[PDB]
Design an enzyme around this catalytic site. Sequence first.
Site, PDB file in Angstrom:
ATOM      1  N   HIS B  41       0.804  -1.236   0.000  1.00 25.35           N
ATOM      2  CA  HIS B  41       0.000   0.000   0.000  1.00 25.35           C
ATOM      3  C   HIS B  41       0.837   1.285   0.000  1.00 25.35           C
ATOM      4  CE1 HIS B  41      -0.149  -0.570   4.532  1.00 25.35           C
ATOM      5  NE2 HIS B  41       0.304   0.666   4.418  1.00 25.35           N
ATOM      6  N   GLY B 143       2.818   5.979  10.172  1.00 27.47           N
ATOM      7  CA  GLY B 143       4.196   5.805   9.682  1.00 27.47           C
ATOM      8  C   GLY B 143       4.850   4.530  10.206  1.00 27.47           C
ATOM      9  N   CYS B 145       3.883   1.412   9.545  1.00 28.48           N
ATOM     10  CA  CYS B 145       3.701   0.273   8.657  1.00 28.48           C
ATOM     11  C   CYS B 145       5.043  -0.193   8.171  1.00 28.48           C
ATOM     12  CB  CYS B 145       2.810   0.638   7.481  1.00 28.48           C
ATOM     13  SG  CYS B 145       1.124   0.852   7.976  1.00 28.48           S
TER      14      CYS B 145
END
Lengths: 306, 306, 4, 4
Positions: B41, B143, B145
């Site tokens: 993503h 942030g 991920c």
Amino acid sequence: SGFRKMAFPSGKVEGCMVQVTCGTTTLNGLWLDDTVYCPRHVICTAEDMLNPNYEDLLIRKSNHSFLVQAGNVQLRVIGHSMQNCLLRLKVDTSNPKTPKYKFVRIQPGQTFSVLACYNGSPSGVYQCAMRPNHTIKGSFLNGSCGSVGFNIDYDCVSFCYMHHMELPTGVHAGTDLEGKFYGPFVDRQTAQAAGTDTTITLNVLAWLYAAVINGDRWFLNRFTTTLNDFNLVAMKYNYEPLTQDHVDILGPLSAQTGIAVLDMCAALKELLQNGMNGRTILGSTILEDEFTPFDVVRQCSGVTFQ
Amino acid sequence: SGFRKMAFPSGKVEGCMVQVTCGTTTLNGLWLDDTVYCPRHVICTAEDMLNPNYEDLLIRKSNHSFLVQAGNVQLRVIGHSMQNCLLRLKVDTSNPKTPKYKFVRIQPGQTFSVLACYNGSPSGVYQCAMRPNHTIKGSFLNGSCGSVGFNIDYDCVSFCYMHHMELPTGVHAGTDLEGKFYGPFVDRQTAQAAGTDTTITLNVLAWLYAAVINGDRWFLNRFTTTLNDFNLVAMKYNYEPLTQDHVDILGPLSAQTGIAVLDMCAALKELLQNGMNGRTILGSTILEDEFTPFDVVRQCSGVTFQ
Amino acid sequence: VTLX
Amino acid sequence: VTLX
């Protein structure tokens, strides 16, 4: 979102752990530039421990009395000295993994990360608070002495603790990196007992702010309190008295949440008097006191879930 | 003595964290040999997230669409591919800090250490269990991920988790290092909800053994139970049923303590029916389910405090 | 959901 | 005390 007891990444400290042997005693030491630091009781035997005289035990050692092992490599000792309850061993090699660092003496209620180590090899990392009675509730087995506590800010490691011993209640005692014990403890096998402990009020309040920032308001109320009236409640529930300096420290968390400190104190006073029973705060059934205001700001969003 | 939620030392993983940017999205990736792994993503924008088509979104990217930053150094991307919910970016440089590693798919009830990271830079370490509902109770902000979960055995890192998202209840969901989600979740902004959770029975029992090994017997009783009778109690208190394989797993802890598993099950059944209220186990007011039998053996003495 |  |  979420809130976990969280330790500092440990790599900069892992690169500093070595093994120190004297006679039949082996334990961990900390290798910065060309010095290795370790607990002085490394020079003792079991009957030496009942009533050791370190100055006398030490004059009897040479440099080659100490074996320092960094991984698979032997570090040759080229000088030694006692500093309070530690030894400083000078080795022929500077640690190339030495991080930027300081030695700090931490204050009660403050937190740090502990890298538990055995035979110079790190085995795990956890967070704990310096209790008001100058002990910590650690997890330590034989051979853990010389394991260190630290905080990190930017790329600077502030070492604040070196492990030495366990008390009859299962709690732990140790020194700063100048070899000075935290609390009234001494490095000998004699009757010593942790003093009575209290709950770290400032931390409980910080963690209630944590809970509000993460979106929970259930324990708030419409009351306020004077500092003095809160403190009469604090004393009865074995909480540290709250001071104006502690009130001030909570300023930034107060401002982020729009909840006045003395309003949160009233909320706390209500929780102590009436309980939570049934209900949780940040997943906890009890009031948590091992997060500092700084620990909350570090981990929480700088934006409140309103 | 003592018992703490304890994370694995994190240095071998710190040496693998990088930053990955695509357009205006920045997140973390994992750099092993000449590949960087990150959540797919990273190629999406906000309106892309409602109903993304990754195969279609990806064909529209080149190698120079991805910026990979290792510390201050830019890594040039020389190939890319999608694997389930991750991207594999091939870079021109092998990570010289690559540890010995494996990719493992962890099973529910198992634990691992999470290195929370922002902008490719590690910020803290904590332990958590894979819940039976395939979520974890982590601590993650925007942030995070691409932050990873791992266990260590000897000098081999077994990566088991990569972080992707947070669900409305504040719990966290992510994939293994093959990009396959844990649980029925998908990487899109659509209504998804964690399923109902249950307590990890095997873990509760392991931690009661922990408590006995550390010297506490107060919750034991003179009763035994059949597996089947325990399970009727388990079901009513929302505990996972206990199986013979779970009974077997507890063999070594049973043997160290001289307490039969079904005897500890009777003890548990008594704790569920009558409560603890007032009393603590290993400092806890509640029954803890985030330590595996393996976590107990790792941390406890191999010798019981009798 | 919140992607992070 | 226990020295560790």
